[PDB]
């Protein structure tokens, strides 16, 4: 996900340019390129942490006639009427003494604690109750469901459950009219690039390519996501990722701008300064280097390294665009200057290199 | 020259190790890095990881990763491979490779250590070819995705060591009769042998060198 080392593998030709005309990359935007225009605003995403099964609690409502003729009881069934029922249910749960009941009466008995699992995707009520252990859920054309003795209904004693959401403050990412991303509120660029529509919980929004679902007002038009899709939960441990990229990222950004104030003042131009202004994030951006004491740059696409030795498979290889770059004097852009002994040194690899250090050939051997 | 020795075999345990060695000579044992590849009875080679023996930097295949651990030793240039908590699907002959000057296609490879225990995808058509010899014939290798002509052509007779007989899906290898060529556009590549001999029936597997890690196809046999 986050490299170890970006490499261009589209690279163009070398122009001489001016030291006021560099400038620290753009890590922020992902491969999502001329989306720049950054607008502060509101989203909607899944409340953090784990949510377990979203309880809906209701009552099985059932009629009985009751017949009584002069202490022999004769007891008949019919199906009752939504507002009565409900009507009923006030009745027992307010305490109403009304409740309790050749002379006939007609009496509607309601079964409280009869709890539902309801699905977050659409509206569905879950129970044995229900014919085939589902209702469609409770619209506002029906306001009850069946049950499996289509006798008896089963309502809602509905007052908050889907309260699964969270307000979110990011950034909305779009050049014109079109919304390629967002930053979110831990300061991560989200694309939209290949979402999908996804109504959760009666919510319309968006289900990212990386499974993460937010709602947003996009302008633009997206093709609903299947009947089988699925959304990520919000766990603590995505936004410790985040917070890990993010500090990253934000650290290195404050050291390349130091690295270039320090170019401005000094008109300097080292190669340990170049190598802060390399791009970080897959995507188009800028390279550097110096021949014969002349500050250059070039286009670029920047590809995300996975292994140092993808890009050094030899002695003095730098492998770009499929074979090894050619050096002049012994450097290459963002300051790869060739070893002491032709072998290629990178920076970042060289620390990386450093911190595993203590492992190999320990070599206290001692003489005779 | 350039010898790759590696040694005839190893009956090891379930849950044991075993350490393969393999002591090149030839070049430069530093200037080079060292591939592995694994390679099941009568299966593809599969990439295991890669070590630079002068950085000692490794490279690991997620499925490898805990399971093979690379090592060098510069002053006698012999790289080990060390595997632990084998199980019966670790049985297989393991070959130590050398690759290009640039590291897309492999020039050397080992005599093999035969251990017994007791991405883009490159889907090859077909498995199986029986034709007869002086014929011409072709056989299609196609990616997961665009990989322009970054693919490679291997030929192994029995018990031998892979050879590669087309490198970049059209250019010819110095050495290796004329009979095989390639018609590499964008996905679709074509390996051609015309007038079949007897020494050509053989598994042939294509390679990918575009993207990491290294991926090979399920082979084609005559």
């Known amino acids: 996900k986050f490299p170890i080392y970006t490499i261009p593998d589209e690279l163009g030709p070398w122009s001489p340019i001016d030291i006021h005309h560099l400038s620290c990359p753009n890590n922020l935007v992902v491969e999502d390129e001329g989306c720049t225009n950054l607008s502060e605003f509101s989203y909607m995403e899944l409340k953090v942490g784990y949510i377990s099964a979203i309880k809906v609690n209701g009552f099985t409502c059932t009629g009985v006639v009751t017949e009584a003729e002069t202490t022999t009881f004769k007891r008949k069934h019919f199906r009752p009427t939504p507002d009565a029922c409900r009507a009923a249910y006030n009745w027992k749960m307010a305490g109403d003494p009304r409740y309790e009941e050749r002379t006939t009466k007609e009496s509607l008995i309601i079964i409280s604690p009869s709890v539902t699992d309801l699905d977050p995707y659409d509206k569905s009520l879950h129970s044995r109750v229900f014919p085939g252990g589902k209702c469609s859920g409770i619209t506002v054309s029906s306001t009850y469901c069946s049950t499996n003795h289509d006798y008896t209904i089963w309502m809602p004693e509905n007052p908050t459950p889907c309260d699964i959401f969270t307000n979110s403050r990011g950034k909305r990412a779009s050049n014109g009219n079109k919304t390629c991303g967002f930053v979110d509120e831990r300061g991560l660029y989200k694309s939209l690039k290949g979402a999908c529509r996804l109504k959760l919980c009666g919510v319309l929004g968006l289900r990212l390519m990386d499974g993460t679902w937010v709602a947003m007002q996009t302008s633009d038009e997206t093709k609903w996501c299947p009947p089988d899709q699925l959304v990520n939960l919000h766990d603590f441990r995505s936004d410790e990722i985040e917070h890990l990229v993010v500090e990253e990222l934000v650290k290195k950004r404050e050291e390349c701008l130091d690295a270039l104030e320090s170019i401005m003042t000094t008109k300097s131009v080292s190669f340990r300064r170049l190598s802060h202004l390399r791009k970080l994030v897959p995507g188009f951006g800028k390279a550097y280097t110096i021949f014969n004491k002349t500050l250059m740059e070039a286009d670029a696409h920047y590809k995300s390294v996975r292994t140092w030795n993808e890009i050094i498979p030899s002695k003095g290889c730098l492998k770009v665009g499929g074979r090894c770059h050619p050096h002049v004097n012994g450097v290459f852009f963002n300051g790869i200057i060739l070893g002491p002994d032709d072998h290629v040194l990178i920076p970042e690899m060289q620390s990386s290199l450093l911190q595993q250090h203590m492992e190999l050939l320990k070599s206290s051997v001692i003489p005779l | 020259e350039v010898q790759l020795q590696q040694f005839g075999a190893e009956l090891v345990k379930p849950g044991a190790s075993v350490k393969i060695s393999c002591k090149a000579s030839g070049y430069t044992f530093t200037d080079y890095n060292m591939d592995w590849v694994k390679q099941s009875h009568g299966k593809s080679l599969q990439w295991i990881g890669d070590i630079s023996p002068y950085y000692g930097s490794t490279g690991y295949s997620q499925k490898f990763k805990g399971k093979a651990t690379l090592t060098v030793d510069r002053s006698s240039s012999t790289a080990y491979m060390e595997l632990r908590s084998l199980t019966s699907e670790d049985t297989a002959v393991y070959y130590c490779?050398?690759?290009?000057?640039?590291?897309?296609?492999?020039?050397?490879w080992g005599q093999g250590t035969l251990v017994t225990v007791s991405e883009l995808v490159m889907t090859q058509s077909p498995a199986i070819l029986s034709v007869s010899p002086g014929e011409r014939v072709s056989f299609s290798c196609r990616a997961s995705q665009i990989i322009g002509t970054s693919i490679h052509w291997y030929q192994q007779r029995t018990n031998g060591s892979p050879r590669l007989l087309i490198k970049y899906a059209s250019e010819s290898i110095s050495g290796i009769p004329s009979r095989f060529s390639g018609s590499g556009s964008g996905t679709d590549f074509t390996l051609t042998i015309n007038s079949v001999e007897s020494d050509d029936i053989a598994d042939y597997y294509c390679q990918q060198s575009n993207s990491w890690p290294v991926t090979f196809g399920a082979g084609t046999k005559l």
């Open positions: 490779a050398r690759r290009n000057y640039d590291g897309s296609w492999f020039a050397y």
